[PDB]
């Protein structure tokens, strides 16, 4: 009903209620603007730059921007007004000067935040395009920057922008791809069209809502595509001239480039120089505009991308028609990832298991790998949403997957794409922060985009809604406004059992072929005399209510769950000089009752004998015993965990070969290993009534995963157990699977496939914290913020 008018309402901030016509920055997208929106609000006359002959002109209100004497007071000068007409310098030509305090106009309650978001801005553009992006390069060198910023999976636009806005993984915010089916709604979300505007898709609490709820006004973050960039910038700078009571504190600009061109020309096509130059010019406009308004040393600016861009061509497409015979009974969400479901919910013939097998290791150079979503690397956090199909295809970088060839030529064109695994170098993107609240000329380590919501809340004095960041892990980016977290309180205190049971009280079906000077010696070990060696960073805290026992040994310390009948964690340190030994022949099947732990809170060997699918392994490896006599400790029933034979191939190679490899490379390592139970694939520790599988005929729960956290000195001239400074960590969460079908080369020796498996399942300490309810690194000499940064680190193994 578009017969109202935008007179006095151009880019109004509160969207008004239909059937009233709209004048906001989204009205175009809803085909809902007032009849006169173009005429009044999208003025273009005379373009975007003052020229010497316009200087001091008489205001003509038709003009796109103004060069008249009254423009600064009206807040609508062209951004280069002061340069052309008042002998000022462009911002980019001024020397960098530390911004120690906000230098703001009277009436500003807080430094505004401007988020300058760029689509497809691959991390290596900062170096490779540096000659053509002077404004961006100045932000980067003068402010705070990371070498790259890791997006979320899938590395698609809307998932990543909405993660930037919420601090949530896609599985939690609900935007799990650029297209989606929700079976509860029975509704589909797509790029073209109108279902995507329905608020039911968009979960969590984005920043603009966080701000508004806490009394901080926000600019609208979404811009209709036909609003030119120059007008987006002028609109931000006009909002910044509003009266104090009406002026927002937070704003966003969005550019469709360089992604748009990247799809057509590839990430480094010669056609890509011009898009980068144009984005740089836009930054130049904003910064000159801010300088004219005396806000260039007041506003915090974030320059951030959503994802990178890889080389991808029509010829590098895998077709499911080459694998499946039944291709017409499936629906594929295709491209740089695959999602499969049945075409019809009425077809009771459809079998996921037979689709997975038809897609598993079928061609020698196969460029995708099928997964049930719960088997995807836990670092992707891509499973706990009904909109994510059970069957997933992880597509190799530089490829696509499509159902049938006709899907590719009845739709070559494109040379770039994105969406792959968020660890891929080509998918990484950019972060720069510049302003009074950011540090000066500071480089920070790469970090994940899920962290930025909390920092944007810190920048605006807002309490963040509950999110997937680790608040405090990015304190090192900030001069002021840091968030001073406290360590979580321990909820369950351990028991410290002594010798309480005689050997003959145990009837576990286990067998094992097993001085005065050093009778004293081993009592001291059982009491915790080596614990300083093996537990370097304090006991992990247990953050839920449970019953557990600390068990000390010569070579390792454990926290043993009376509820799960196995350790929650097992801690041990392996020096650079440590020797690997074998399991002696007489000890191959040895399992020994632990006289500190009741038969009733023990595992039993008969269950493993009866369970024809399930075997067992050990958390502290017998191979790394300090002596023949200490080795007996490794065969305690309290160090045993359930393991599928297929998984024991992986585990044994880790423990026999890789631990000592790491200790020799890193100058000792401290290892914490344990089980994980996540049968509902939510990324969070299961309660015991959530466990779906037990060792047959027993109450021994079967883990879904095994973790290890491997810590050493960042200065590897110091040994792990005498480190004065910062730490270095790598971690994994390995799937506990009954086959090695994930690894196509598993018939080969473990030296050819195990380590590549472990790399794929690399993890953050924080990932393990969520999955176990444990809190690590409780007793170090480091600041808590530094430890939080360490807990968020991911070792990615990219070149
Ligand atoms: C990443 O960070 C996020 C945010 O912190 C973490 O997610 C949170 O985790 C909590 C635990 O899983 C969860 O808390 C539960 O929420 C229920 C209330 O939920 C609504 O209200 C909130 C608040 O405004 C809202 O955010 C929710 O939004 C979700 O759902 C809507 C759809 O309505 C989506 O638009 C939105 O995208 C979001 O979806 C995501 O989360 C849901 C779960 O809520 C998933 O199903 C989706 O797939 C998607 O991932 C909701 O609108 C509350 O009812 C729960 O309490 C029950 O559960 C326990 C038992 O387990 C029990 O103590 C209670 O008594 C109660 O039990 C009864 O209900 C049971 C379940 O129905 C029933 O079976 C029993 O028999 C009982 O009757 C619970 O507190 C919180 O909602 C989410 N939040 C978000 C935004 O996702 C996430 O864990 C972090 N990830 C990692 C790895 O750390
Ligand atoms: O059309 C899309 C996306 O299309 C996907 C298609 C595609 C294919 N390959 N690549 N992309 N748009 C239009 C649009 C408008 N305005 C914003 N504003 C942003 C600014 C900002 C800053 C922080 C957090 C959130 C936001 C939202 N974002 C967008 C994204
Ligand atoms: Ca994008
Ligand atoms: Ca769980
Ligand atoms: K068995
Ligand atoms: Na295999
Ligand atoms: Zn794109």
DSSP codes of every residue in 603-631 = --HHHHHH-SS-EEEESS-GGG-SSHHHH
User: Which DSSP string do the residues of 482-510 spell out, in sequence order?
Assistant: -----PPPP-BPPB---S---GGG--SS-
Ligand 6 centroid, distance to 650 Cα (angstroms): 12
CA distance 178 to 200: 15
Handedness of CA 595, 597, 603, 606 (dihedral sign): positive
CA distance 97 to 371: 52
CA distance 706 to 378: 12
- E strand residue ranges, 133-235: 144-145, 149-150, 180-182, 187-189
Experimental technique behind these coordinates: X-ray
Is 80 known to sit in a ligand binding site?
A: no
Q: What is the largest distance, in Å, between two alpha-carbon atoms of the chain?
A: 105
Site to probe by mutation for ligand 1, drawn from 165, 172, 466 as the one with most ligand atoms within 8 Å of Cβ, is 172
Q: Count Cβ atoms below 10 Å from residue 273 Cβ, excluding itself.
A: 14
Contacts of 328 (CB under 8 A, 6+ apart): 343
Angle, nearest 10°, between helix axes 784-792 and 765-772? Answer: 90
Residue 599 DSSP SS3: helix
Q: Count Cβ atoms below 10 Å from residue 783 Cβ, excluding itself.
A: 12
List, edge to edge, every strand of the sheet that includes 391-395.
Answer: 330-333, 337-342, 391-395, 368-372
Residue in 139, 149, 130 with CA at minimum distance from that of residue 276: 130
Ligand 2 centroid, distance to 157 Cα (angstroms): 6
CA distance 303 to 115: 6
Is 307 known to sit in a ligand binding site?
A: yes
Residue 308 near residue 296, CB atoms below 8 Å = no
Q: Categorise residue 101: left if φ over 0, alpha if ψ from -120 to 50, beta otherwise.
A: beta
Resolution of the experimental model in angstroms, please? Answer: 1.6
Contacts of 17 (CB under 8 A, 6+ apart): none
CA distance 367 to 135: 40
List, edge to edge, every strand of the sheet that includes 431-434.
Answer: 250-258, 113-119, 300-305, 431-434, 144-145, 442-443
CA distance 486 to 471: 10
Contacts of 39 (CB under 8 A, 6+ apart): none
Query: Helix count (H) and strand count (E) of the chain?
Result: 23, 28
Q: Which atom of ligand 1 has the smallest separation from the CA of 767?
A: 93
Q: Which helix (H) or strand (E) holds 648?
A: helix 645-653
Residue 597 DSSP SS3: coil
Q: Which atom of ligand 1 has the smallest separation from the CA of 387?
A: 48
CA distance 569 to 231: 57
Ligand 2 close to Cβ of residue 456 (< 6 A):
no
Residue 752 DSSP SS3: helix
Ligand 1 close to Cβ of residue 203 (< 6 A):
yes
Ligand 2 close to Cβ of residue 309 (< 6 A):
no
Ligand 1 close to Cβ of residue 450 (< 6 A):
no
Residue in 54, 45, 41, 111 with CA at minimum distance from that of residue 80: 54
Instruction: Kindly report the length of the chain.
Output: 799
List, in sequence order, every residue forming a beta bridge with 134; answer none if it has no partner: none
CA distance 419 to 335: 8
Is 157 known to sit in a ligand binding site?
A: yes
Ligand 1 close to Cβ of residue 680 (< 6 A):
no
Residue 123 near residue 136, CB atoms below 8 Å = no
Residue in 100, 97, 96 with CA at minimum distance from that of residue 479: 100
Contacts of 319 (CB under 8 A, 6+ apart): 401, 402, 403, 404, 405
Terminus-to-terminus CA distance in the chain, angstroms? Answer: 57
List, in sequence order, every residue forming a beta bridge with 762; answer none if it has no partner: 732
Q: What angle do CA 651, 657, 661 make, to 5 degrees?
A: 125
What is the C-alpha radius of gyration for the chain, rounded to an integer number of angstroms? 30
459: tokens are: 């920048």
Ligand 2 close to Cβ of residue 224 (< 6 A):
no
211: tokens are: 């701000």
Return the active site residues: 157
| Domain residue limits at 711 | 503-792
Ligand 1 centroid, distance to 170 Cα (angstroms): 14
Angle, nearest 10°, between helix axes 157-166 and 452-460? Answer: 40
Residue 209 CA: distances (Å) to CA of 220, 248, 346, 454 = 10, 13, 41, 14
Site to probe by mutation for ligand 2, drawn from 25, 121, 192, 221 as the one with most ligand atoms within 8 Å of Cβ, is 221
CATH code for the domain in which residue 641 is found: 3.40.570.10
Residue in 778, 603, 634 with CA at minimum distance from that of residue 703: 603
Residue 394 near residue 369, CB atoms below 8 Å = yes
User: Which DSSP string do the residues of 347-412 spell out, in sequence order?
Assistant: -TT--HHHHHHHHSS-STT-SEEEEEGGGS-GGG---SSTTS-SEEEEEPTT-EEESSTHHHH---
CA distance 738 to 727: 35
Ligand 1 close to Cβ of residue 155 (< 6 A):
no
Q: Which residue has the tokens 């309660």?
A: 687
Which DSSP state fits 515? -
List, edge to edge, every strand of the sheet that includes 548-552.
Answer: 548-552, 557-561, 566-574, 669-676, 705-713, 727-735
Ligand 2 centroid, distance to 159 Cα (angstroms): 9
Pairing of strands 391-395, 368-372: antiparallel
Q: Which atom of ligand 1 has the smallest separation from the CA of 682?
A: 93
Handedness of CA 120, 126, 130, 135 (dihedral sign): positive
Residue 789 DSSP SS3: helix
Ligand 3 centroid, distance to 307 Cα (angstroms): 6
């Amino acid at each position: 009903a578009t017969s109202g008018s935008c007179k006095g309402r151009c880019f109004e901030l509160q969207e008004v209620g239909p059937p009233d016509c709209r004048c906001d920055n989204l009205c175009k997208s809803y085909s809902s603007c007032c009849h006169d929106f173009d005429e009044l609000c999208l003025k273009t006359a005379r373009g975007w730059e003052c020229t010497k002959d316009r200087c001091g002109e008489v205001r003509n209100e038709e003009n796109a921007c103004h060069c008249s004497e009254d423009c600064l007071s009206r807040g609508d000068c062209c951004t280069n007004y002061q340069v052309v007409c008042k002998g000022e310098s462009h911002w980019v030509d001024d020397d960098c000067e530390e911004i120690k305090v906000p230098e703001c106009p009277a009436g500003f309650v807080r430094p505004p935040l401007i988020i300058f978001s760029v689509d497809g801005f691959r991390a290596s553009y900062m170096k490779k395009g540096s000659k053509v992006m002077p404004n961006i390069e100045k932000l980067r060198s003068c402010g705070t920057h990371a070498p790259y910023m890791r997006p979320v999976y899938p590395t698609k636009t809307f998932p990543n922008l909405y993660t930037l806005a919420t601090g949530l993984y896609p599985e939690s915010h609900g935007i799990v791809g650029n297209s989606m089916y929700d079976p509860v709604f029975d509704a589909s979300f797509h790029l073209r069209g109108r279902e995507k505007f329905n608020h039911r898709w968009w979960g969590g609490q984005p920043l603009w809502i966080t701000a508004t709820k806490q009394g901080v006004r926000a600019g609208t973050f979404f811009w209709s595509v036909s609003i030119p960039h120059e007008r987006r910038i002028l609109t931000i700078l006009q909002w910044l001239s509003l009266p104090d009571n009406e002026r927002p504190s937070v704003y966003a600009f969005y550019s469709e480039q360089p992604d748009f061109s990247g799809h057509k020309y590839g990430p480094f096509g010669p056609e890509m120089t011009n898009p980068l130059r144009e984005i740089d010019k836009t930054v130049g406009q904003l910064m000159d505009g801010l300088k004219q308004l005396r806000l260039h040393r007041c506003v915090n600016v974030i320059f951030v991308g959503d994802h990178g861009m890889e080389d991808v061509t029509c010829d590098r497409t895998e077709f499911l028609s080459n694998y499946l015979t039944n291709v017409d009974d499936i629906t594929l969400v295709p491209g740089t990832l695959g999602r499969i479901r049945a075409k019809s919910i009425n077809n009771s013939k459809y079998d996921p298991k037979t689709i997975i097998a038809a897609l598993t290791c079928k061609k020698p150079d196969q460029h995708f790998k099928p997964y049930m979503k719960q088997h995807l690397p836990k670092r992707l956090h891509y499973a706990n949403n009904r909109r994510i199909e059970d069957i997933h295809l992880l597509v190799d970088r530089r490829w696509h997957v499509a159902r049938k060839p006709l899907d590719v030529y009845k739709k070559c064109f494109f040379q770039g794409d994105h969406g792959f695994d968020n660890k891929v170098n080509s998918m990484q993107t950019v972060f720069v922060g510049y302003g009074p609240t950011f540090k000066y000329r500071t480089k920070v380590p790469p970090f994940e985009n899920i962290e930025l919501y909390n920092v944007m809340c810190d920048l605006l004095g807002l309490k963040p809604a509950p999110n997937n960041g680790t608040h405090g892990s990015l304190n090192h980016l900030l001069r002021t406004n840091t968030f001073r977290p406290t360590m979580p309180d321990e909820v369950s205190r351990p028991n410290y059992p002594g010798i309480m049971y005689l050997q003959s009280e145990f009837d576990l079906g286990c067998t094992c072929d097993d001085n005065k000077l050093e009778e004293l010696n081993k009592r001291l070990h059982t009491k915790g005399s080596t614990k300083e060696r093996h537990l370097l960073y304090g006991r992990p805290a247990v953050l839920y209510r449970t019953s557990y026992d600390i068990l000390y040994h010569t070579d390792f310390e454990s926290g043993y769950s009376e509820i799960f009948l196995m350790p929650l964690w097992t801690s041990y340190t392996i020096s650079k000089q440590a020797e690997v030994s074998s399991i002696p022949e007489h000890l191959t099947n040895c399992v020994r009752p632990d006289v500190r732990v009741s038969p009733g809170f023990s595992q039993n060997c008969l269950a493993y004998k009866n369970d024809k699918q399930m075997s067992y392994g050990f958390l502290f490896p017998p191979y790394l015993s300090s002596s023949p006599e200490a080795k007996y400790d490794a065969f305690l029933v309290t160090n045993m965990v359930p393991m599928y034979p297929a998984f024991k191939r992986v585990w044994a190679y880790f423990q026999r070969v890789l631990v000592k490899k790491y200790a020799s490379e890193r100058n000792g390592v401290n290892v914490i290993s344990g089980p994980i139970f996540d049968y509902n694939y939510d990324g969070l520790r299961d309660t015991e009534d959530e466990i779906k599988q037990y060792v047959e005929g027993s109450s021994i729960p079967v883990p879904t995963h095994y973790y290890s956290i491997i810590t050493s000195c960042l200065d590897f001239t110091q040994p792990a157990d005498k480190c004065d400074g910062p730490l270095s960590v790598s971690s994994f969460i390995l799937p506990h699977r009954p086959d090695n079908d994930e690894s196509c080369n598993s018939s080969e020796d473990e030296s050819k496939w195990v380590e590549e498996l472990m790399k794929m399942h690399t993890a953050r300490v924080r990932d393990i914290e969520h999955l176990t309810g444990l809190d690590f690194y409780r007793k170090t000499s480091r600041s808590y913020s530094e430890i939080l940064t360490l807990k968020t680190y991911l070792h990615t193994y990219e070149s």
